[PDB]
């Protein structure tokens, strides 16, 4: 079942990476009323807000991550949260960790003798899922600071988190199986 497990792990890793990259790139994260001119139905992502319908349908404007005026630097928690949201450090970190896990799996398919590469890939996928969770929480909290809804980029990110956790579990299972087989062979040959 090593071949089936490896195929499932690779397919899931690629799917999670692609979903996370698409969610980061696209701008259907939220559906809220707003403007795209520097109150109409607009769809926004992590970088830009674009208006749908109306006279200016299709016009995109970059998201202002520091609204209001006077630049009130009274509470450092708000500034830290706003900087974290503007940088989108956690979704990008999730993308990078998923890419690293996929590269680890690909390299392991070459060497086939260093078991720690599989463990590294599993750790990468689990950490990518955790980073995705943090990024989702940061995005929602920053949005908190008019009925709204979440688009398909948000749910693509959620699905990517789920698949990343599943692939991490599969990679850990493969590492455990490899070490069990090594121990069994050593016991038989001793």
């Amino acid at each position: 079942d090593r071949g089936v497990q490896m195929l499932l792990t690779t397919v899931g890793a690629f799917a999670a990476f692609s979903l996370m990259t698409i969610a980061v790139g696209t701008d259907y994260w939220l559906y809220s009323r707003g403007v795209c001119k520097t109150e109409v139905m607009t769809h926004s992502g992590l970088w830009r807000t674009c208006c749908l319908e109306g006279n200016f349908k299709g016009l995109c404007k970059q998201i202002d991550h520091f609204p209001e005026d006077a630049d009130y630097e009274a509470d450092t928690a708000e500034y830290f949260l706003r900087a974290v949201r503007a940088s989108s450090i956690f979704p990008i970190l999730s993308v990078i960790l998923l890419f690293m896990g996929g590269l680890c799996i690909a390299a392991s398919e070459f060497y086939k003798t260093r078991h720690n590469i599989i463990l590294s890939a599993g750790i990468f996928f689990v950490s990518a899922g955790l980073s995705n969770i943090i990024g989702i929480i940061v995005y929602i909290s920053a949005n908190a600071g008019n009925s709204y809804s979440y688009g398909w980029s948000f749910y693509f990110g959620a699905l990517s988190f789920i698949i990343a956790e599943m692939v991490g579990v599969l990679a850990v299972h493969m590492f455990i199986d490899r070490h069990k087989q090594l121990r069994a062979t050593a016991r038989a040959t001793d």
């Binding site: 989702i136 929480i137 956790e165 991490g168 579990v169 850990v172 121990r183 069994a184």
Partner: protein
């Protein structure tokens, strides 16, 4: 117009939808990390059985029991597993206290768009319970039929 009664799933009203989906994600992550820190190291293995019993399904069961404030037959023993368990316990305490602060008030609020609780306010919980019992019966019967078919085929 007529005052609207709480919905069939009004027991989810004390928390927002984002909180619920983040709780689900946190639960999945906690179970996965608990399984990882429990089972990955070959030095916790002795064909070969593990020192602990925290496989992925057992980890999910333990985390669910911790969230439901119930507990199971097992408990983590290692340092890394106990860190996961303690932080999950703190999360559960905070979240469950916040959820159960005003559950009855959320279950009976009438919206235009002290009294005893009525069965209509918990009918959804009862429906979910009966559906779960039916699903468990179906799963058990499917497993039984599969095992019987496999045994018969092995015999012949």
């Amino acid at each position: 117009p007529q005052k609207s009664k709480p919905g069939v799933f009004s027991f989810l009203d004390p928390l927002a939808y984002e909180i619920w989906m983040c709780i689900v994600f946190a639960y999945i992550g906690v179970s996965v990390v608990l399984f990882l820190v429990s089972r990955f190291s070959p030095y916790e293995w002795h064909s070969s059985e593990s020192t602990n019993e925290f496989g992925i399904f057992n980890s999910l069961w333990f985390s669910l029991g911790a969230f439901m404030q119930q507990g199971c037959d097992i408990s983590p023993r290692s340092l890394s597993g106990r860190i996961v368990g303690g932080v999950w316990w703190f999360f559960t305490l905070i979240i469950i206290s916040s959820y159960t602060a005003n559950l009855a008030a959320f279950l009976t609020v009438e919206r235009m768009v002290t009294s005893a609780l009525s069965l209509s306010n918990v009918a959804g919980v009862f429906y979910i319970l009966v559906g779960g019992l039916g699903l468990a019966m179906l799963v058990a019967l499917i497993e039984f039929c599969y095992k019987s078919r496999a045994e018969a085929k092995r015999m012949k």
